[PDB]
C-alpha cells in the first residue's frame, strides 16, 4: 500500500 | 541425465527441470521451466527457458494525508507489466524469444519448435503443425493491454505489457487519458474507493495482476564452462491517478505517470550444462 493505507 | 526426461527422436532428448520462486514483498510468484536440449546433431547446449507465475497489480485506493487534500484520493495501479531475462557471462547467449514482435490481441499463443541439428522455428500460433521434434508454448491474457519487446539482444530479454485502451461507461478511453477509472462519488461520505472505477470496470491487469508466459532460448557451445548464470525479473510500473471533488466545478484529476518504476522481483539462477541442473542463487 505504499504507507498510503 | 535426470528426472523427467523426454525421447524427442534418434539421439536427442528434452530434460525437463522447474523452478518455483515468490515473494510477498514484491507480490510476485516466477513459476518456470528450464528445458535442456540434448542433440548429439547440435554442437550447441540449448535451455528452453518459460517463464510463467503471477505479477500482483498492487493497485489500491488511499486518502491522500495533510491540509488541502481532504477531498483528493488515491489510485495506484499498474501502467506496465515487466518481464526479463538477462545475462552476463560470456558463455550463453539469446537465440530466439517469444513474442518476438509487438501483440496487442487480447489473448496471446504462440509456440516455439525445435527439430533435430539445431534448428528453432517459432510461430504467432497454437496447434500449427506436427512437425517439429519438440515444441513448447506461451499462452497468456492481455485484456486493454498490449505486449512490446522493449529490450532484444544476444545478452537480454526484456518484455512490456503495457496499458493501452480501456472500455468505460462513456466509451473507450486511452491508457494517457488523465480521467481513466476517476468517477464522481456518490455521497461526500464516499471512501477513496468511491472516488474510482467499480472492479466491474476494471479488466484483470488492473484488478487483480498477470499470469506471464514468455519464451528465450539460452544458447551454450558444448565444451565451453559448465556454468551460466542469468535473472529472471518480473515486476510491473506503477501510475497514480489523483481525483480531488471540488465543490462546484466537480471531479478533478491529474495522473502521475510511470509514478513508481521497476518495482520488480529479480531472481538469479544458475544452469549447470554438464550436469542439466539448475538452481536458484542467493
Known sequence: ?5 | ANTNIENIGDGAEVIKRTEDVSSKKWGVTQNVQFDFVKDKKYNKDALIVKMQGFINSRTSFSDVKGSGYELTKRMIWPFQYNIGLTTKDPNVSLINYLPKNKIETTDVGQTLGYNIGGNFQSAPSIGGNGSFNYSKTISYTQKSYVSEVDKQNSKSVKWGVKANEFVTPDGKKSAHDRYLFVQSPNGPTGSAREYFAPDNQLPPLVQSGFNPSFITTLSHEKGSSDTSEFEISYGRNLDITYATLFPRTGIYAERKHNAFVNRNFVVRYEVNWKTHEIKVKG
Not at chain 1, 500500500?1 to 493505507?5: F, H, L, T
Open chain 1, 1 to 5: 500500500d505504499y504507507d498510503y493505507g
